[PDB]
Design a protein around this motif. Sequence first.
Motif, PDB file in Angstrom:
ATOM      1  N   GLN A 166      -8.463  -6.463 -11.986  1.00 37.77           N
ATOM      2  CA  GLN A 166      -7.874  -6.216 -10.688  1.00 37.77           C
ATOM      3  C   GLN A 166      -8.851  -5.363  -9.889  1.00 37.77           C
ATOM      4  O   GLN A 166      -9.292  -4.316 -10.360  1.00 37.77           O
ATOM      5  CB  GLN A 166      -6.531  -5.510 -10.869  1.00 37.77           C
ATOM      6  CG  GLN A 166      -5.453  -5.839  -9.869  1.00 37.77           C
ATOM      7  CD  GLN A 166      -4.283  -4.878  -9.977  1.00 37.77           C
ATOM      8  OE1 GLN A 166      -3.146  -5.294 -10.198  1.00 37.77           O
ATOM      9  NE2 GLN A 166      -4.559  -3.584  -9.841  1.00 37.77           N
ATOM     10  N   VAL A 168      -9.500  -3.208  -6.394  1.00 37.42           N
ATOM     11  CA  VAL A 168      -8.876  -2.599  -5.231  1.00 37.42           C
ATOM     12  C   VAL A 168      -9.930  -1.917  -4.370  1.00 37.42           C
ATOM     13  O   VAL A 168     -10.688  -1.076  -4.850  1.00 37.42           O
ATOM     14  CB  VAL A 168      -7.789  -1.591  -5.634  1.00 37.42           C
ATOM     15  CG1 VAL A 168      -7.292  -0.837  -4.417  1.00 37.42           C
ATOM     16  CG2 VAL A 168      -6.638  -2.312  -6.299  1.00 37.42           C
ATOM     17  N   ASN A 175      -6.394  -5.911  -2.570  1.00 37.14           N
ATOM     18  CA  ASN A 175      -6.027  -5.972  -3.989  1.00 37.14           C
ATOM     19  C   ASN A 175      -6.093  -7.418  -4.476  1.00 37.14           C
ATOM     20  O   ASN A 175      -5.203  -8.215  -4.188  1.00 37.14           O
ATOM     21  CB  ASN A 175      -4.619  -5.374  -4.178  1.00 37.14           C
ATOM     22  CG  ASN A 175      -4.098  -5.443  -5.620  1.00 37.14           C
ATOM     23  OD1 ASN A 175      -4.725  -6.007  -6.515  1.00 37.14           O
ATOM     24  ND2 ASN A 175      -2.908  -4.863  -5.829  1.00 37.14           N
TER      25      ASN A 175
HETATM   26  C1  LIG Z   1      -2.177  -4.833  -7.073  1.00 39.18           C
HETATM   27  O1  LIG Z   1      -1.108  -5.798  -6.915  1.00 39.18           O
HETATM   28  C2  LIG Z   1      -0.246  -5.969  -8.052  1.00 39.18           C
HETATM   29  C3  LIG Z   1       0.769  -7.016  -7.663  1.00 39.18           C
HETATM   30  O2  LIG Z   1       1.548  -6.594  -6.551  1.00 39.18           O
HETATM   31  C4  LIG Z   1       0.393  -4.634  -8.420  1.00 39.18           C
HETATM   32  O3  LIG Z   1       1.227  -4.786  -9.565  1.00 39.18           O
HETATM   33  C5  LIG Z   1      -0.696  -3.603  -8.683  1.00 39.18           C
HETATM   34  O4  LIG Z   1      -0.116  -2.342  -8.998  1.00 39.18           O
HETATM   35  C6  LIG Z   1      -1.588  -3.469  -7.452  1.00 39.18           C
HETATM   36  N1  LIG Z   1      -2.625  -2.476  -7.681  1.00 39.18           N
HETATM   37  C7  LIG Z   1      -2.744  -1.365  -6.947  1.00 39.18           C
HETATM   38  C8  LIG Z   1      -3.856  -0.438  -7.333  1.00 39.18           C
HETATM   39  O5  LIG Z   1      -1.991  -1.122  -6.008  1.00 39.18           O
END
Ligand SMILES: *[C@@H]1O[C@H](CO)[C@@H](O)[C@H](O)[C@H]1NC(C)=O
Length: 381
Positions: A166, A168, A175
């Motif tokens: 992931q 960010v 994201n």
């Molecule tokens: C990125 O998006 C996912 C799906 O909504 C979420 O679960 C995750 O916490 C998000 N990451 C951040 C760092 O906000």
Amino acid sequence: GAQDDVPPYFKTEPVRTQVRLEGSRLVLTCMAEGSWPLEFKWLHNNRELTRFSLEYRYMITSLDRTHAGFYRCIVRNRMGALLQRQTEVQVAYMGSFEEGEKRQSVNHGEAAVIRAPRISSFPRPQVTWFRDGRKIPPSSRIAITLENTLVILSTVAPDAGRYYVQAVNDKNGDNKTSQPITLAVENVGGPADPIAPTIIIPPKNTSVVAGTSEVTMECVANARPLIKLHIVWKKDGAPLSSGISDYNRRLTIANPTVSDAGYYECEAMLRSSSVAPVTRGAYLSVLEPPQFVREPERHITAEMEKVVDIPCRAKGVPPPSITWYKDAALVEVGKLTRFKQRSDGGLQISGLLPDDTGMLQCFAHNAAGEAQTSTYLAVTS
Ligand SMILES: *[C@@H]1O[C@H](CO)[C@@H](O)[C@H](O)[C@H]1NC(C)=O
Ligand SMILES: *[C@@H]1O[C@H](CO[C@@H]2O[C@@H](C)[C@@H](O)[C@@H](O)[C@@H]2O)[C@@H](O[C@@H]2O[C@H](CO)[C@@H](O)[C@H](O)[C@H]2NC(C)=O)[C@H](O)[C@H]1NC(C)=O
């Protein structure tokens, strides 16, 4: 004389670097002072952007990646002109993961090195590793490198499945999630024989500009059994007892200066074992931006047809190059010209003409930064 003749100068200089969001309004400023009227003109990557104007601000209504780069203004008044220290405008943005899924293999007991999927972005994003929807944090057997590389130490059969990241972007909040890297662990289930210590992620030659809060060396090692694996850091042959974190895989040097430059080495070894330890090392190089040692008097007066020297001495690592400007114009210092540049950096002008009057401005430049200093030269009859 009844009229004011205070030459231009900068009240404050612009930031060296600034990150701004795509589509935002950008207002660059020339915080210049001096006898009125002051006129302002702007450069982008040293190509003229505007004509002289009474406006000290340059405004970009909506910022895109084409409008990134270096900006500096030229300011003039009746007395002369100065060239501003430049600022780098960096446009924050993030695209999407384009590489696609990958398949990767590792032998039982060896370490799987999975580079993080590339994504177009500025600044470099915060990267989190996932498997099966659960976050993968660093542990005794899982390392994450300064480059967001996942390293699974002494791999076993369950360490196989799909790994993804992931990303960010902390500037615009974007994201995105990558395509998986599929990992296979092969020759599973033999005897768990010991594996000699090896350094998988060795220390990198590293550079840092003095003034940076921190610099880190990194060393990831593999062995079986892992519990007996021990990492020792050495500076000048003697082990370091402080500054080490992240399962011994990291060395942190706080507020580095040249004193901290040198060869840092990493030794991987097994406790309670006869196996030979392995050592890898690298060089930490610390750069220092230019600082003036001697700056000219803000006013220099010299008689016509005589000779005058204008001092400009700066220190830095690497030793900074020195460049002269006359009213924001590059001074041509070739032979067959009245202008000679000294070894200590100073500018020497001979056969002084009345047109030599005006601002003389000196830039000290090196990879770590730039400094500017200037003086008003008056050629008297
Ligand atoms: C990125 O998006 C996912 C799906 O909504 C979420 O679960 C995750 O916490 C998000 N990451 C951040 C760092 O906000
Ligand atoms: C890392 O860099 C060194 C050289 O870096 C410079 O030299 C150091 C002594 C120090 O002054 C640093 O601040 C400098 O930036 C590389 O060493 C070279 O290695 C080759 C063989 O690989 C050898 O033949 C050369 O003589 C070495 N050069 C010097 C100047 O010593 C080293 O290989 C680099 N390590 C990497 C890239 O992993």
